[PDB]
Amino acid sequence: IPGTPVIDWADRNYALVEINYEATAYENLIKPKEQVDVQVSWNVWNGDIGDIAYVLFDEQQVWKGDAESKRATIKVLVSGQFNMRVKLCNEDGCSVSDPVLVKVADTDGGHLAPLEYTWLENNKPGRREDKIVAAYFVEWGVYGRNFPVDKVPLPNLSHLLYGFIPICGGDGINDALKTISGSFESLQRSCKGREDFKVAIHDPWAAVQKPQKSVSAWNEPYKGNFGQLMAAKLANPHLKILPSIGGWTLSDPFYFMHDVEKRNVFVDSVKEFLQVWKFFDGVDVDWEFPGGKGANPSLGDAERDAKTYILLLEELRAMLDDLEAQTGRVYELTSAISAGYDKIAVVNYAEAQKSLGKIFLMSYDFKGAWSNTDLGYQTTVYAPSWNSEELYTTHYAVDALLKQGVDPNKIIVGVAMYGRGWTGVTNYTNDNYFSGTGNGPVSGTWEDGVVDYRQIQKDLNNYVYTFDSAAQASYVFDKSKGDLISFDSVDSVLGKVKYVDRNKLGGLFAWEIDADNGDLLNAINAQF
């Protein structure tokens, strides 16, 4: 028998996608790899080197070669952990080394352990499984809001939408970003040396670099929101995770995509992004909005954008089908859309739904502190009791989509987990505050004019509360400060559940998950 082989000490943690934990540019951040090369070297003690050498992974042969070299190199394609041994043979028989643990990491989380949700606040088990129940998780919530992925009530969600994946571009291309201090500068860093119109990550620190629960080791392959999402998917195998591209301030590049050159760069970038970040199950298109009236007033062209949107969806669906065939997986394609009828009219949704599995109707932000004059329900199902002629309602938006021929199955109704409101509202009559005028935005939790649902509850005693059962909408008022806030409550949300059930819609989705204390998400999952 040959001498006993002993494997040399080595870093044996490998990554099919390498992360530079100091990089700020997306192109330095990741190093995607075809394969990983597992390296082993050994020495032989008390006997001969053997006539032949084998490498075993969990007692399966993965290499044979020269015993005299005392070295082997083994190609590995997929993530996982396994025991590696060296086995030396001669005519007599074999001697085997002690095993070493080898770890190959990849973005499907194959090297990870499940990250389970511990039940926080008022959240309660029970998920409505015959409907779409989705929520947006915002990338930047890991800061002030202190809401990392591990606080997300994933057992009660069918879908988690990651907001937001940006499109690369500087001056002229992401000007909307300039309305938020540092936001445009931050994106420029992330896209440094990266071609315009490619997808990237806005905050690679929050996305992958920041230590978080269960991904905080010194040599952790993937940290941040992304690392947490890989692990959380293992704990919640029902869940689908979608990268959401665009949103209010990141939508500008879409307006340039009538040009097939830029559109091609974008679609290819998306394809590469999903191959790099295996934990995503598709793509959510959140263009705000075809036709304009988004964060950037200069932008928008109705006839041109309606076609761009259709073309873009078609090409994304065709790309996603290639991925499906190539990986054996099922990839979704969705879009978040305005619930304003004047924005809905821009787009042929009967044509769009030929590429889309779901449409996230953004039935909120109907009204807000951008105007002191136009006071009303920021979200609501029907027209208010005091104004039966309101068109900015969930019912009208849904009706408009139905009239266009959209399957009601594909329509997902939006729930705001925050309120929009005004301060100092006066010059009104008969305690109808909505006939008054505001003196500015209500003081806000994180931004002014907007209040987390959780903050609203904590502050309930400061307010007189009103439900409008005709409209299925709620609000609060504090004469003391003249504070008026319209928001989704347990009542109005149950209203929306009833509305969705009655009209056979696809389900509901919330914006944004960190603002809830569990009340609203429980309500969303209520089954009648």
Ligand X SMILES: CC(=O)N[C@@H]1[C@@H](O)[C@H](O)[C@@H](CO)O[C@H]1O
Ligand Y SMILES: CC(=O)N[C@@H]1[C@@H](O)[C@H](O[C@@H]2O[C@H](CO)[C@@H](O)[C@H](O)[C@H]2NC(C)=O)[C@@H](CO)O[C@H]1O
Binding site for ligand Y (CB under 6 A): 248, 340, 365, 370
As measured in angstroms, the least distance from the Cβ of 456 to Cl ion is 41
As measured in angstroms, the least distance from the Cβ of 255 to ligand Y is 16
24 scored as a contact of Cl ion (CB under 5 A): yes
- Beta pairing partners, 89: 52, 94
User: What single DSSP character describes residue 164?
Assistant: E
Residue 288 · residue 295 · CB < 8 Å: yes
| Direct distance between the N- and C-terminal alpha carbons of the chain, in angstroms, rounded to an integer | 73
- Beta pairing partners, 282: 332
Please tell me the distance from the alpha carbon of residue 38 to that of residue 73, in angstroms, as a whole number.
Answer: 6
332 scored as a contact of ligand X (CB under 6 A): no
23 binds, among ligand X, ligand Y, Cl ion, none (CB under 5 to 8 A by kind): Cl ion
Please tell me the distance from the alpha carbon of residue 493 to that of residue 519, in angstroms, as a whole number.
Answer: 10
- Beta pairing partners, 74: 38
Instruction: Determine which residue in the list 37, 98, 129, 321 makes contact with Cl ion, applying CB under 5 A.
Output: 37
As measured in angstroms, the least distance from the Cβ of 266 to Cl ion is 23
Q: Give the chain's length.
A: 528
Query: What six digits make up the tokens of 73?
Result: 């190199």
The pairing of beta strand 13-15 with beta strand 100-105 = parallel
Q: Which stretch binds Cl ion (CB under 5 A): 24-32, 199-207, 305-313, 377-385?
A: 24-32
Q: By rule CB under 6 A, what string of x and - marks binding of each residue 243-282 to ligand X?
A: -----------------------------------xx-x-
As measured in angstroms, the least distance from the Cβ of 76 to ligand Y is 44
36 binds, among Cl ion, ligand X, ligand Y, none (CB under 5 to 8 A by kind): Cl ion
As measured in angstroms, the least distance from the Cβ of 403 to ligand X is 16
Q: Which stretch binds ligand X (CB under 6 A): 8-16, 306-314, 413-421, 466-474?
A: 8-16
- Indicate the residue among 84 and 415 with the shorter CB distance to ligand Y: 415
Instruction: Determine which residue in the list 305, 390, 468, 512 makes contact with ligand X, applying CB under 6 A.
Output: 390
- Count CA atoms closer than 13 A to 225's CA, side-chain side: 30
Q: In this structure, is the dihedral angle defined by the CA atoms of residues 80, 329, 335 and 499, taken in order, positive or negative?
A: negative
Query: Locate tokens 């665009």: which residue?
Result: 246
Residue 527 · residue 125 · CB < 8 Å: no
- Minimal CA–CA distance to 230: which of 203, 208, 209, 205? 208
User: What single DSSP character describes residue 252?
Assistant: G
391 scored as a contact of ligand X (CB under 6 A): yes
Instruction: Determine which residue in the list 182, 193, 328, 461 makes contact with ligand X, applying CB under 6 A.
Output: 328
329 scored as a contact of ligand X (CB under 6 A): yes
Please tell me the distance from the alpha carbon of residue 227 to that of residue 107, in angstroms, as a whole number.
Answer: 8
Please tell me the distance from the alpha carbon of residue 434 to that of residue 456, in angstroms, as a whole number.
Answer: 19
Instruction: Determine which residue in the list 219, 388, 462, 527 makes contact with ligand X, applying CB under 6 A.
Output: 219
Active-site residue, 195 included:
no
- Beta pairing partners, 418: 452
391 binds, among Cl ion, ligand X, ligand Y, none (CB under 5 to 8 A by kind): ligand X
28 scored as a contact of Cl ion (CB under 5 A): yes
293 scored as a contact of ligand X (CB under 6 A): no
25 scored as a contact of Cl ion (CB under 5 A): yes
As measured in angstroms, the least distance from the Cβ of 180 to ligand Y is 9
98 scored as a contact of ligand X (CB under 6 A): no
109 scored as a contact of ligand X (CB under 6 A): yes
Please tell me the distance from the alpha carbon of residue 104 to that of residue 389, in angstroms, as a whole number.
Answer: 61
Instruction: Determine which residue in the list 1, 12, 25, 43 makes contact with ligand X, applying CB under 6 A.
Output: 12
Please tell me the distance from the alpha carbon of residue 229 to that of residue 246, in angstroms, as a whole number.
Answer: 20
Out of 139, 220, 288, 390, the active site residue is: 288
Residue 525 · residue 128 · CB < 8 Å: yes
The residues that touch ligand X, with contacts defined as CB under 6 A, are: 11-13, 108-109, 219, 233, 278-279, 281, 328-329, 374, 390-392
Q: Which residues are part of the catalytic machinery?
A: 288
The residues that touch Cl ion, with contacts defined as CB under 5 A, are: 23-25, 28, 36-37
